């Protein structure tokens, strides 16, 4: 009767309530500063804002009814209190008996765990409201929200394989382009560190920027190991392309502003394959890139050139990319470590 995902959600939330349990209230009171009313206030105002945006219509999203949103919010508030208890009981400072007031007064966590729990609920129901709607109506920055996705996947083993597949989906959407928009808090994080971008060796071999760029680098290394297998290139060209992709992140970080991450990885691919004796054309490249799951055509057919005016991947390579990256590439007419 119910969908595999709607019935899995109902199993996790079964017997539980939209309120802290006696065990979580015993961890909230152990705290010099008890977080229970701050938590309930965050939840109240996230529920209000969700309901208001759910209840009213935009040119691209028709609004729907109070009753389906109050049910949708209630089941997400049950999942929140369950995943928060798992988080906090399994925390090192509970197993050592230390105060967890600081850990439980970080509002960005409570906001982004309620938001993830609302997207779990919405996707299980195949909602017309597709990510990034919840974090956009909840005023939540992609650069701060993605960090709870790993926490939810680790803290609820009842999550279906489709729900995990989706959560890893939206986490890569953030590491691809929603955290690189011009109004992203990532550029703030860069600013307070003198705009020095971490290199792969600094994060791979504890830092908002460190754990962002270590997920970025890991994701880009996966998408590169596929491209280099389906175009049969040398492992040392892979080492060289990867060094130019690092160069464009560290020394030309503005190239990612309001852009996609595979746009700078494909141009790193063509420019280093062309500088060496292993020339593969953008045509040969997009034929193999096409088969990658994140590849929609707009990645190589609607690239931002200046701002607005949009072109395609070849014209972005010729008008913007080669001017700022030829210096480095022409040195191959020290390579960075490639990880797993």
């Amino acid at each position: 009767e119910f969908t595999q995902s709607v019935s899995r959600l109902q199993s996790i939330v079964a017997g539980l309530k939209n309120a802290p349990s006696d065990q979580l209230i015993n961890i909230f009171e152990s705290c010099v500063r008890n977080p229970v009313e701050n938590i309930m206030k965050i939840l109240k105002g996230i529920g209000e804002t969700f309901c208001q945006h759910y209840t009213q219509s935009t040119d691209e999203q028709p609004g729907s009814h109070i009753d389906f949103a109050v049910n949708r919010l209630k089941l997400a508030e049950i999942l929140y209190y369950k995943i928060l208890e798992t988080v906090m009981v399994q925390e090192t400072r509970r197993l050592h008996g230390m105060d967890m007031s600081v850990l439980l007064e970080q509002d960005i966590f409570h906001r982004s765990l309620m938001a993830c729990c609302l997207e779990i609920v919405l996707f299980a129901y195949s909602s017309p409201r597709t990510f990034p709607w919840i974090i956009e109506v909840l005023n939540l920055q992609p650069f701060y929200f993605y960090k709870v996705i790993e926490v939810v996947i680790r803290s609820e083993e009842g999550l279906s394989r489709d729900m995990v597949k989706h959560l890893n989906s939206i986490e890569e959407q953030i590491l691809e382009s929603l955290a690189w928009s011009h109004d992203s808090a990532l550029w703030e994080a860069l600013q307070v560190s003198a705009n020095k971008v971490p290199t792969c060796e600094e994060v791979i071999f504890t830092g908002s920027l460190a754990l962002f760029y270590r997920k970025v680098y890991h994701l880009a290394s996966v998408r590169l190991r596929d491209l280099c297998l389906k175009l049969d290139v040398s492992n040392e060209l892979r080492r060289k392309i990867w060094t130019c992709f690092e160069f464009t992140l560290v020394h030309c970080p503005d190239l990612m502003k309001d852009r996609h991450l595979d746009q700078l990885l494909l141009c790193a691919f063509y420019i280093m394959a062309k500088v060496t004796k292993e020339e593969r054309t953008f045509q040969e490249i997009m034929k193999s890139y096409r088969n990658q799951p994140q590849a929609n055509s707009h990645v190589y057919r609607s690239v931002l050139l200046k701002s607005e005016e949009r072109g395609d991947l070849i014209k972005f390579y010729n008008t913007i990319y080669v001017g700022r990256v030829k210096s480095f590439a022409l040195k191959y007419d020290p390579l960075s470590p490639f990880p797993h």
Binding site: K274, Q283, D312, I314, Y317, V322
Partner: peptide, 11 residues
Amino acid sequence: LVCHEVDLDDL
């Protein structure tokens, strides 16, 4: 290191 391709239509 200019690309001399015109379009990326052909697969």
